[model samples]
Target: AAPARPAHPLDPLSTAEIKAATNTVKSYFAGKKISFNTVTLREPARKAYIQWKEQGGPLPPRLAYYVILEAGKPGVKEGLVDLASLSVIETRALETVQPILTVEDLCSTEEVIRNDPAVIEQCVLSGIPANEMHKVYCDPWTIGYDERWGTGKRLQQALVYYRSDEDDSQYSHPLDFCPIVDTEEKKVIFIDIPNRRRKVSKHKHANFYPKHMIEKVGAMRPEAPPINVTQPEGVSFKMTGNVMEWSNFKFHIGFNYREGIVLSDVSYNDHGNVRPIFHRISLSEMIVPYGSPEFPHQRKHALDIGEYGAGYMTNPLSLGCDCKGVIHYLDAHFSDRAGDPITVKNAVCIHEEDDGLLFKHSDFRDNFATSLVTRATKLVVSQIFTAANYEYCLYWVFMQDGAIRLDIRLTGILNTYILGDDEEAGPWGTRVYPNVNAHNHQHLFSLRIDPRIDGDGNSAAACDAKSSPYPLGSPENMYGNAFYSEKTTFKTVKDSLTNYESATGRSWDIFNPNKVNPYSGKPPSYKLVSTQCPPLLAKEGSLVAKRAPWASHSVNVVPYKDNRLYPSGDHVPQWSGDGVRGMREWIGDGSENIDNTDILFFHTFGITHFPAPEDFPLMPAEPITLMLRPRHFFTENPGLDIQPSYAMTTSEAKRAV
Candidate 1:
């Protein structure tokens, strides 16, 4: 048993008691005799003061040394020196020591203040006005007085030599090159700063390959002239001559839709029932080729697309569909040769529905839900390869109480390839699929709308939707079938539905309260309700109804037997050949060879939407740019060039060294 608790166990030390104790300690120390030994002085202390005088101070004096005798041996020699005579090093060292002592005393006082609650309480009511907190604290430092200080201007100029190998050479693919440059004494050092890459059109010349030409040849079925399948002679251009002569080469070759031809009066249906309506608003050609000669590859690619002009169309939700249309039309018109029809699959159209909510054929059934989550997982993994070319874009939409959710990912490929002995072999090996890799890589764009509120005013609450129709968390989820298996429990789904209903339960809540109808002065209330499905898994497991295959042959090894009905399985090869053979087989005949191979389930955003009146022509903005320049780009401090720190000098080593 515990001893009976004392009603007033001796109270802890009060503020007054603590204060008296502190004063007593201070008095004791003040009365004590402490030896002052000059021998203990640090050299920097003397040097600092000495240097300070050099900047314009009176000269220091000399000191007289006196020997102090000890019991057995000579102890510390005493020195009587004029303070003015102390070297800058000695003065600085001494100054440093005094602050250390001051800090220690301050720490002790602070501890005392903290331990005494009464003192703290009194301080709270001390009537001292509070000082405004400083956003940032800085102390003025004497430059010349500090030996470590020096000018940074030389370092700034040294940064130009840091570009990556690929970026330093103009002919390198803009998609893959890192452009920042840094120069070293004997050689130009390359520095690959992450997330910097030149922007070029997806249709750039580097992206066009023999396979692209083959595709065009096959589609055209040239009857009159023999088609040439042999590789074309390499065309080389000197940066000094060709690049300089073409002023337009400086800018990208694509039409600047932002300033290019504009169209007005575009309309589209929201219900997906009627065809879109449109009338020409206005058309104007601004500047051609928006990039410069330094980025010749991008310029060339843009020219290839624009040299052959195309018809354009517009709609409310088309986004950049008009741009796509222009490119497609141009390709078809220019690609035609000798009465051979050049079929271009370039028609661009945007559906009014949010891309995220749109369901693909693969989303059906419970086992496939896990695959949906991985739809964008690839983008996350690709970011590891290079930050410059990685772009994540996604759009999600929850329809009618979360019954249906759609997501879309879009982004451009950097068109990167490995350099070295096997450099000619595309980054992954042979160019079996031609420009498919480049075409498939794109910027990710996203849009998501969900109704659940999780008992909060915000709609960000997680909805317990059923996983895909398949098994939860399977390797197949790495592909397309995973989205259907990871289904949420019925209870969770019900809870999410309930929360959504509560949010929009009232008529007033459904309408745009801010808008007054011109005719009624009353807003129209619209509430989304449950819609009927064709039937649960009515077409489940039916290959005929399945949408385009999601896996790229270059990526997946599954053999697709040459059965036209299911050509996706035809390209998969037997496991016997070299890795390159397998890769080539997959690229040429695997899943990529399927009839509707154009559909790519990449984890990127397709397009961006901003609601501005100027968006009427709604030209696409310059593609998001990235550069993988050399690491030496910042050999000098990177932050020196921009603002208050600007200083000019001509020394490269100082920047980095």
Candidate 2:
């Protein structure tokens, strides 16, 4: 209060001064419009460092001339200049002459043009253009050939417009810019304009179209019911065997082969890919052998395994025993590209020990192993053409603890030759049978067991034996082998057989009918047989296998679960929940994870029986996914805690990084 008031403390620009400044800025762009253009350099430019030294001192930023508008015209034209040697006065002169000019700032061209109204108005009259100026500041790093920048003859015309009223301060100098060009005009036009006074009007015309409109066609109603809309009737089939009856085994057969079966005929998306169907019957006891009879007979060799039935594993014969029941019957169809069809029906069962004794012996494991090896080999042969004339020497065995395994060796001469210097260097190089070319090679599978309850386990020993040196021959003794010289050798075959022995000794086999080990020296101890093939009765005190909740009956037509069949013409199969239901019913209130004493079954498609050219690059082995049903393994939803939550209220806590 004591201080004296300052004279003209808020000295503002006089009307004359303001008008002069505005006029000066406006005159700078007289008789010109702002535009963009593309130009290519004939030769690569020297490094900035070299050029800087050659010219002495630092180089000045370049200056470009762009005409915002000609007198009374509504568009702009563009021109360029190298400002590397321009003096300060020359730079200012260039800036003063052009409506928009940027020195060394390649990214600021749009900004300079946007600040000038005359250039904007002309650009709008031509066509709608982009707010590239706004993007320039936001993403200054991006400055290169961009079609949106309007180049060459396209840049000959401006694409923006603005109108001003002298009396209205807010509307005195509005800026308009276009982001797109209407092809008909062959010129870019202004689409966006910053006008605080006419916000509503500008927004209303933001998406306005100057192009002609076409009439809309009336809607047409239905023809026939859209194909694949209706769910097909479920198929039903009968089951045989005491265990099957106990589990109330029943399934429906959709799309009967006899009536008609064409892959194209199936309209539903799920039906088109997955053709045949399978479901679990119930949980039951199943005894699998360790290896086939071809394997070395050993004492105390058998496994009491568990599995889910009705085609669980991928085997052509579809016979495996985990803890569930046997996969008895398989109904699937094959089709040719021309629509010709072939029907396939296969049956499988879990072989059990003949006698129910604590130490009894059986060949069930051996038989199952043999079946798997044979089927797997056949599948590889049928699918892989290069595998033609190839022969597989198979071995399967059971360990003392109750493990089963199978191994196959590709033997005999290959039709092709090793082209490279080293036999191992080429495609046909020497290696194990079912080499890089073998399809469905991973299907050569194995099984594991727990030693606490089963016989004394020797899994480690088995693994070591399988990986040991080929007992047949040394590298120096080349032709001493009776088969092919380099790649295919007796040693390779022996190694493969050894692998089979090791695998069988550590797992269970499902195909064999006999559970007891005939070669076991034990005093005809029926206990061994009993352990391998436990009784199916409720009070049998045997472990059983049940289906996992996530388990589906989808039969992968491709090798393993890979979707290779998509390229091939074959259709895969989808599963129904019936198997899951059956397993649940059988387990009835039991803890989900408790190991059930049941057999597991799997089915293999015929397509995997042959190989194609695309399979030339041998693929990695396929792994089998044995899922434990959800109820048996998990209780409440396990993924709930990870979900994200959103709220409308703004909280600083929510902004935490």
Candidate 3:
């Protein structure tokens, strides 16, 4: 039998492609000691992708982007392998930047710290006996960017902790000292010692595991009866290869190492016509900034997507646990350090959820005899990944009425540090438990949107609900209750640099100026309704601001370009944010025209958490939601054709023949 080809242009790389890509690179650099750092698909350009999708033309070229580490090399070698030709097309040596931190690199830190005599002496100074060295544990993380090394060395800082037994949670008993390790050399280069040392907590471990919970509380509470979900028939959505079709909606699902899930070429069926909505959408980058100004605590900010890849850390989901009721799962593939294939089973979950009632109507004149109630069913595609001490759960939702949404839930144990029993955490942090000080922090995410509303000649604007300009007693505002939507069109990249306004309830609209709705005479548009926009608290010129320039504003619009996926740059682990890369480079001069052209919209929205006592041991899930909905894209109600859950006809009303 012949080898099967990918179904769509945006389909993820297959196992055969991965093997050919690596062999091509190996053949090019023959007889050299090299290790695989990254090997993922290089998506096709926008123009080429659209041509193949719409015109039924030839398939786009298949290529794989790769990064490798050579023996005794100062920097990494980056290149692209053309799968069609089985040869390397482009290659470059990046001397000033380093690739992302891998799980293998992170796992090596604990061994480096546990064996070093310098780190052991520091642990003993913090009230741990020399014989108890095995009990010391650490959660290794990327040293976001340290000025001392300045991209000269690949590094990770070991946040030390103490665990009496393997089952006991380490966050409750954090240690005072931190060790910095050079990943390439596999050694601990330096250990940061605090001026005031603190011993481990005397309190019992705040354990949450089943056996430990029973020991602490004397016994488990009364258990509730199990509830199960079932689908008598089957799932409503049809998955052909990596493409999904359900309720007149169609889109492609792609998975990569950096961004866990990518949705591309989303379209909706209007009667018999196929209308394209978005070309590509994904979570570009994010940063978690801690509020502590203390010595080594300043090294706490983490760019999780760029530093530690979401796909590399993604959890292998379990059946009947992570999802319910007739679910479908997709496996993700990657390359290991030995240039071998690595697969994470059930990396993405797809299912349907009952979304309450979509719409309802009743007539009081007939004692509600004439009525209609339609239930809503939503399609959800989700993935979960763990970065050190926290878990990030992402969901992309689709509604029947031309609406798309992104929902994120934050969970897992809170990162904690040690504090004296008699001292207070002051304004910097909150003492969640006995000597467990949890610092304040913010999770800011960058959402990238490449929309092709109607036909691609689109523009964006900020629409604010405002009071009438005329004062009371005037003809326009006789009772002072008048209000209107004040829309400000964005002409250039500078004009689109805006922020969320709570007073006027600001929302952005991306519309096709040349296309108009026949009934309302307004441009066909999709509006973004998100209220969780938190301004970057870090001041100007600060490391946090410099590292995440896309997060400074809630909305940023720039001209679309090829290979502009990540907002923080390609090599994000060690590059100083001050360099000319990513969003800073995209918005050069801020004078580029963005009106009525192909554009990339970047949105930053998230929450700032001040830890509390209730968020200890294991924190409950916190949710953040945003939506993109149709405005004037359709006439009347697009969902009116759907069968209603209940429908009635009154005798007094007009009868149905």
Candidate 4:
């Protein structure tokens, strides 16, 4: 129990080590030739693999090939064969390692509408009809570029999926055509095709589904029967590897491809010992913007986990359609850009969830103190993404009284394009189909916490209950005054931002001001509380408000910058006039005090979406909570010591307790 930390280089590469790095890149270019365009598994430098994972030992594994050669292939000068070839995940006799982090292998956007010759030369330079490209539906975006989108600085924009199969036989139905890929000129960069109607406008499809489709949206059943949720007396949670514990709570679960699911270290269990609160939590960066004034919808925003990677659009989580209870799931290996070794199955889900009556009181006249209490059985850690036409569901709940919640939800299929209800649509669309429309957007979402209080230089304060200006009497309003709780704190770097003041109902804490709270003396904290915040209605030097100024303050506190771990970096639509670029470009350039030392607490939550019409074909999951809440990091109610023998009565006077 002291040394089991081996495989975890974000584990994935094994399909027998991706055929031994594809037979060591075809026997290191056997015959001195070349020609193979994929072979991936190279990801070992996050500051030298997290300092070789704190100096453990043996982890040699890497691979990320892509090739092409043949022009009289000799000791080769090679032409048209993209590079990026790093290696060394050695399993014996085939190691190629480091400095090999090249580029030029962009593909997937459904392989750019099933095969991209710069997307068929921008759908035949927009005349479209050379067979339309399979009623196309591309979507792969990221816009960190300039110099007119040519060379490459990690650029690759897309979202042109307007297909029409009314005709076209050779299957060329790909339109709206704005393809931009230029990973060092790896091709594809044609623009303009916005307003619609000409660039081949004609995309109709109910594309229903398995049965009776929308069937007038009926069947909301419950003939009242099976309700099942039994634990019999098992599953309290214990995973050890991606770290999990239950009843009191522990954390650590990761996934990538850009912040898909990542909750780390988090802790709780105080009336006894274990501390800390969040030393890494994520869902860091997700924008979605879109509100067509037309023209690439003025470059329709979207930073969904920074350009098509909420861990590459993850959606694999069904245990009865995405998590029930007592569940365990979690399997996600990650790869696939031809390096192929993508595991996915149950990509993250953990459960306990009872969350009702987690706190109860009964003491009628001190005699009827009958104890009907329960709850702390919560745990829940889930993930779900679909990112194209929307679908996101991330939830990190962990209550037991020492609260923590980060629920997010939105449903899929609602980015509908064409619109024409009666015509002249404004107020941002929403027609829902006589031609579709659904526009009006905002999504937002950013949560990269990283707290580590009680240790890591932690400090962030704010506690407002202000409103004691009293008004209903004399000598200081003697019979009517109320409200007064203020704490503010932060003294360095600069003011230290944290805003979520519902008219002074304020609360934002993250402390360890050298530790205190021996039961409310203060410090040693963890509160955030939003319940549901919805800001960002765009417009204010717009371009989705300068590509998200952390949706202009809903609390941001910046300071920790390990390559500024995304509040938008990873090259999103960084529309910079001078500033604009995730977490508002680290909010640097002034009053940046992160209080004690290493901090970072961005929170932003959103969703404005005025659509309704059953939100066209699909769009009906609207939930958003935020919570955190643990204040003095628990000196008390840590679920009031769970297990009353794991309660389970479901109401019955004669039952066991």
Candidate 5:
């Protein structure tokens, strides 16, 4: 037998471990005597894992760290490190860094503004004119570089005119310009002028801002006392290392280096036997491809989970702000500039919530109906990440009726660029304010689910229902009342790629044919039903399409491979197609047995956003959810044993008139 793995192999690095790793990294850099910015535990990614746990092998843990440094700070000599790795790897990179690209870590803010005048230079050739440059007023834009457009050693773009001069929130600004900068070179390369004939101005300002802009005061419902979600009897879920056991659900909760929270070895206790359903599951990657006709704007695309580590961007969640109910918080540990530990309290929230009803039935055989309804308790595992101008809330809920749901809520200010009544920019985006254009974008997410049905060697198939040809074809359909389920069982990895069709009864299943349930004369299975999934709106064969091949299909099925984790390549920031390896390459050199092999499911879904006037100032959150239901997994309704949630009315009479 292989050596045993850590009880929770996927657990986040410990403070002590991170400290040691951070120190080792610091020592590696000490010879250079470089002034640092920040460092965090760069986990040995899932792709780096040995095929043990997820594939019934041992997973040994390893420590790696991410270091961020300033480009040309004092006492810090020049260094060359690149990855596309881009300059993103060397400079004070990562989400917290302003995308507009300038040296905020090294330069004195007061000095930069004092030295350079707020200059607006018009482009002589073509394209929109750029807004003026003022250190205090610019908002950095996250951009891709172009050689012919500007000159810089290391750079990012910046815009002008924030909503407030003092409120340092990066989302405040609304401008049409982009100013490129050379961080190591310590200079603004030159602000490109697009829309050459147009004038660049601050069309919107802070003072006349809507009352809702003051989110903490005028707009908030402060009357309610500060709420604390308490578990008077302590939480039902208890953690042994990082493995959580709650009621019938027990799963290993693993924090990712990129994907954030990962759940593995998930199984529920049905009756007395412990049965396996999913081997592991996680949000592999997400892409927000913004649409625009303009130069820099057109080049906008974001890979939140791939390029930026959502798990790293995790903010310490507030008790009253992020979650409610009997909350059990988990702290996240990372490293600071000098190899010190930074603990983000309540980064992961676990709780159980009442979900209306799990089951309800009413008998009307008598004058007064006899009814019973049981409220369902859903166990939720949640986390939030803020990257640039957006916030993503991810929830993995385990339902009493043998269902696992992946729900996402997107909230935050839309990254707006100035439109300034450009009727020409009409098709690509929506004008939300006087100047702001909420760019049309698609946020597509891919989920990776490794299913260990019953035990292993699972069969993958789609179960669809088709109506019988009206009272004519078959003996069972003489009265046109019968229909048949068309089951498409996958024989190879390539054959498993399919999409859902609601009209034809769409749903796919992962099952163990050998383990048949005696009650149903069939094997127990898990069914995937995606409620909100839209394909990528970008044209096929486009650059965006090339980068995000997995987004093309709603479902992807492959046998388990130990080192394969992310749907998109691990380093999406590295613009190369082969950067860190993506889903396309994982498909391998052709046909192979997908049937009766340990299964890996990749489910892709997205939101094609068309912003409106209402989505501005601060866009409201929209919810997207994916449901995985059990198929013939239980002899009867698994929630049938749950007790009635409501008490009988004292004054109510019994039946019989």
Candidate 6:
């Protein structure tokens, strides 16, 4: 049976679309062993989409984008297929770069390491018997950049580990050596041996499973108390295809091969008026750069999104386990090596959560009896993806107060290495367990916010709260307690290249100069309230700096251009950051006028992690939250009209208990 055509043009490519696109590519390369890399929706242009969605225009053509690897080829072949026409429309073969590493590529390296004679010998030297090679496991990651194998050959550096049994945690018994495998050639190319090797730990493996806990602690602790979420009235949100509508907010939930969850065309319905907020928003890219400055450790910086796609590695969420309450799931579709459709069921979880309180008021004179209080509920669109050792739990929250929040929780076991008994971890690493060393690292994310606040002609400005310039005893400020918010409207790209200022409590605002708040006499805007801005620790001209130029600053505004989603170039698998084509290229001259125009606002924010003992075995989820809050955009309190759970006056309260 064939799948029906999608209702909306921005909906993710369906299974039928994937099959058609792959078939088109497979037919184009007939009689050849062409391996499918990726087949996804070729999204319509912003202008065309708006025209079709708003104006009385015909639906835009649906197209599929695909990438394939020819037999014994060095680079990938990419093309587009017109789904309606069922024909290949464009083609290109770039030999200079490689495509993103797929799950298959990462999974294949473990087998390569297990079979390699060199890797087997090295395993024995690290206290593992050669006959017990089957017990050895590896978490293969992209070798960020190896001077020896530049970007010519696809590679993965296997972080070797050993487990006594199949269910044992490999992280507890990590081996000291690392092996570099050629994913294409399916063989080990090099092994990075430590200067001082550490034997496998004799201590019991640090495990978190229920059975393991029973053995260690005699019995599991009392089961945690349960709190259930119920919506007897059913959910308030309504889904019209990929578009979601809840609490006066509407947006398209888009999941692609690269960025996992994209909230596009976000708007709020103020009574009858539909006011546009962000045109599109997503976590464009992220780089987890390990701080250890060792031989092959310099290559530990992994561009998770660009190297291993968030969508490709996303976990199939459990109904009750991952998302509680009456949840709605959206499956994602992609292509496999055989060009077959691969579906990740429950790739996105949408549900509502209780938000303690929205607003409250009371009269103190009437024995504090007269009051009005409103409880709040928020709609959350969330997804969790495991990037080898770490799980990134992303929640896109929509609030009744007209705010959009991106709350990311970092969980999963920390990436560990072996440490000798006598070896000190120095300043670069932490000895979390007996012999397990976890390196200090930073998880910096690039948030791409394309604003259409009220309309398309939006401008970004920096706002800082500063003390009054008047002297302490001046006539203008006799008491000298005056403070005000100083706003700097950016006129050019260079003017907006700024970083977070904790001293002044700085925040950036995306606003429409043409539209003004009727009551405040201010521009309609969304203020970015993010304080977790960490500068890239990598030095200038280094690989980290060259590859992720966008992370150098906290806020960056650029003139909008099509196909500018990625900050660390498109293909981030094996390319060296010598001359990357991303933020560095887009910010050329830095003199482009971005005032009241279609622009992209990129905010780099995250945390600098220092591992500790409690983070070992399994790390608890650590949260990082930021919000885009409406400012001077409504006539009064936007959520004031919400029906309160309890409302009473002094006269009415006399009858109450």
All-Cα superposition RMSD per candidate: 35.6, 35.8, 1.7, 25.0, 6.9, 1.5
Q: List, residue by residue over 1-657, the lDDT tens digit for candidate 5.
A: 112223454666666655555455455565554433334333333444425544676544443435445444321222222211212223233432222121232233223322343333322111223341332355343344343432223354555444334543434344455566554444566666565433333443423244535643466344777645566786667778778887677888877546778887788888888888887789887778888856876557766676556666777787666887767788876555465766778889988876777777665553325566788888899999887568898899988888999888988777776665554446887776665567888889889888877777788888888887666655767767777888899888788777767788678888888888888887889888874767677888665776777887888887676657766653343243433356786766438788887667888886889888777656788899988888888888887766677433322426222
- Model 6 TM-score is 0.98
The stretch of ten residues in a row with the least summed lDDT in candidate 4 is 93-102
**CA error at residue 233 for candidate 6, angstroms:** 1.8
Model 3 clash tally, residue pairs: 0
**Which of candidates 5 and 6 is the stronger one according to lDDT?**
6
Better of 2 and 6 by lDDT: 6
Q: Write the per-residue lDDT of candidate 1 for residues 1-657, one digit (tens) a residue.
A: 111221111111122322222233223335432222111111122223224423455333322111121222212223332222222111111111110011111123322322334323322232211231111111110011111211111000110111122222111222232211110111112222224332321232332234545654455434687433221442111122111111111101111111112121122222332211111111111001111112212211111101112111111122232222111121111111111112223222211121132222222343333221111100000000011122222121212111112222323233222122222333322232222122112122111111111110111111223435545455655443533212111111111212212222211012223334455554322222221101111133322112112111101112222211111221111111122332233344432321111111111112222222221111123332111111111122222222321222323323534
Tens digit per residue, CA lDDT, model 2, 518-630: 34421111011111111111112111111122111111010111111111011101111123233233233432221112122221111112333332222223222221111
* Candidate 4 vs 5: which has more lDDT: 5
Q: Relative to the true structure, how large is the alpha-carbon lDDT of every model? A: 0.20, 0.21, 0.89, 0.59, 0.64, 0.89
In TM-score terms, candidate 1 sits at 0.19
Q: Compute the lDDT of residue 127 as modeled in candidate 5.
A: 29
Candidate 2 local distance difference test against the native:
0.21
Clashing pairs in 6: none
Q: Candidate 3: give the clashing pairs.
A: none
Error of 2 at 488 (Å): 46
Candidate 1: regions farther than 4 A off: 1-414, 422-456, 465-657
Global Cα lDDT for candidate 6: 0.89
Return whichever of 3 and 5 wins on lDDT. 3
**Residues 1-657, candidate 3, lDDT per residue (tens digit)?**
112457776888787787778888898999998889999999999989998989877688888899998888877999998887888999999877888888887888897888999998988888888888889999999988889898888888999999988888899999998888998999999888888889888788889987988888888888899887778888889999889998899999999998999999999999998999999999999999899989888788898998888898899988887777788999999888888878999999999988898899999977787899999999999999999889999999999888999999999989999999887886989999999999999999999999999878889999999999999999889999999999998999999999999999999999999899999999999999999999998888878888888999999999999998888898887677887789989888899999999999999999999999888899999999999999999987888898999998676355742
